[PDB]
């Protein structure tokens, strides 16, 4: 029978089944395409893919799509799950702020420590320890140091991990990325 595109049985391969829509070039997906990336010359498409997937996963879009596209759930269970999600979020936010309000204190104590180092060894000395080019006679030394800093600052492409999808038996959640039990 007619299935939607995100349906389980959507694109079937069988003797009866035949795919629907213009399937190439200007296609069935014409204005329905969620992402587009022009591949930068000499860039493997694996970085492209892992960037896309990290994006979708961190913003909880792949969560949503997996969730809704597998089973039906009544508007009550959907509400319960979404608002539960959002309230757990709220709680953990109010935890993060506490942690952060402490870590800014820690960072302060560190900077203070740095001040005490300053008036033990004198300011200029401390600056020397931190990579100040006081030994730079001419610009060529400067350009060596700054060439070093350039070769550091240039960012090698980050390969960001995407948690695998866990296929369980009757699939209570197809959002399952871990083996922990969940409240449905």
């Amino acid at each position: 029978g007619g299935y939607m595109m995100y349906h389980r049985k959507a694109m079937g391969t069988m003797k009866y089944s035949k795919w629907k829509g213009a399937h190439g070039g200007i296609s069935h997906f014409y204005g329905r395409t969620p992402m587009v990336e022009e591949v930068r010359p000499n860039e493997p498409i694996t970085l492209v893919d892992r960037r896309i997937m990290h994006y979708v996963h961190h913003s909880r879009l792949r969560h949503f799509q997996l969730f809704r596209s597998y089973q039906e759930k009544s508007n009550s269970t959907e509400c319960k799950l979404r608002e539960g999600e959002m309230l757990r979020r709220r709680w953990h936010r109010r935890l993060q702020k506490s942690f952060i309000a402490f870590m800014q204190f820690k960072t302060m104590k560190v900077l203070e420590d740095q001040a005490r180092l300053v008036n033990t060894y004198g300011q200029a000395a401390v600056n020397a320890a931190l990579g100040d080019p006081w030994n730079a006679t001419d610009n060529v030394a400067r350009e060596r140091k700054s060439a070093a800093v350039r070769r550091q600052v240039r960012a090698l492409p980050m390969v960001n991990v995407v948690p695998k999808h866990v296929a369980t038996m009757k699939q209570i959640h197809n959002d399952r990325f871990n083996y922990r039990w969940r409240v449905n």
Binding site: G31, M86, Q104
Partner: protein, 266 residues
């Protein structure tokens, strides 16, 4: 009793009173250690950042001009408020003045049915990045819910301290040992030190203190990788058993055994 922000039972601060740096450091102060002291100056009255959302739900976002273009005919300005898929952000992620939300969902609707915006996807996604506050990991915004960035800067500054410490331990080391190139037999040596300390010991010049040393080094050339022919016993055809392998006794005192460990899948 609860503070509003994270529910703290106190009001946050670092210092309060005018005297505390003095009184804490008092012996140093009479001594006169504290004269050029920049630690008792810089941080003396230093207080915590304001970590607060002045807009918990932004009535500020967007600034006024933007509203003009939140209509159906500005695909770009629609796009700066969506995800890269075109969906809206949940309220507690990207908060918007309710006017903007109305105008925006209406806009995307209209634009879609007129063919001026795609049913999925954000066509302006890259162009719009200027308008979003992309936050560099190198700057620090005192207000973030990012717990990573905070600890990153903590790391950074602490390591900036460690650098100093290491610089000045290797310096004084270099001068204690370089004094020997300055004075060979000049002085600093006791007769009793000649008795006790001139013998080999673990602090002086031990042989090696650890198992698996390197003995018998030679210049011989590398061999061909995998010179060894596979054994006659097939490791491939054997199946690995973990849980039931040995016999165990359960320390479970009372109650039914947890159904998630065993008796569940997978």
């Amino acid at each position: 009793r609860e503070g509003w922000l994270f529910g703290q039972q106190v009001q946050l601060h670092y210092h309060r009173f005018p005297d505390e740096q003095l009184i804490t450091n008092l012996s140093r102060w009479r001594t006169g250690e504290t004269v050029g002291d920049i630690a008792m100056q810089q941080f003396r009255n230093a207080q915590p950042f304001d970590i607060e959302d002045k807009d918990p739900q932004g009535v500020q976002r967007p600034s006024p001009e933007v509203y003009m273009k939140l209509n159906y005919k500005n695909p770009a300005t629609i796009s700066r408020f969506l995800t890269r898929t075109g969906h809206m952000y949940p309220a507690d992620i990207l908060p918007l003045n309710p006017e903007a939300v109305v105008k925006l969902r209406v806009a995307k609707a209209q634009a879609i049915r007129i063919g001026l915006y795609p049913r999925f996807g954000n066509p302006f996604w890259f162009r719009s990045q200027k308008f979003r506050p992309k936050a560099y990991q190198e700057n620090y915004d005192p207000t973030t819910y990012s717990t990573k960035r905070t600890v990153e800067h903590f790391a950074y500054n602490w390591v900036q301290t460690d650098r100093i410490r290491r610089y000045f331990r290797e310096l004084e080391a270099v001068h204690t040992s370089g004094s020997a190139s300055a004075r060979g037999s000049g002085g600093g040596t006791t007769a009793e030190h000649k008795q006790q300390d001139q013998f080999y010991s673990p602090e002086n010049q031990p042989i090696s203190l650890h198992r698996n040393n390197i003995s018998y080094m030679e210049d011989v050339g590398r061999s061909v990788k995998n010179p060894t022919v596979p054994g006659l016993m097939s490791t491939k055809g054997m199946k690995k058993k973990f849980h039931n392998l040995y016999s165990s006794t359960s320390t479970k005192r009372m109650g039914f055994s947890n159904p998630t460990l065993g008796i569940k899948k997978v």
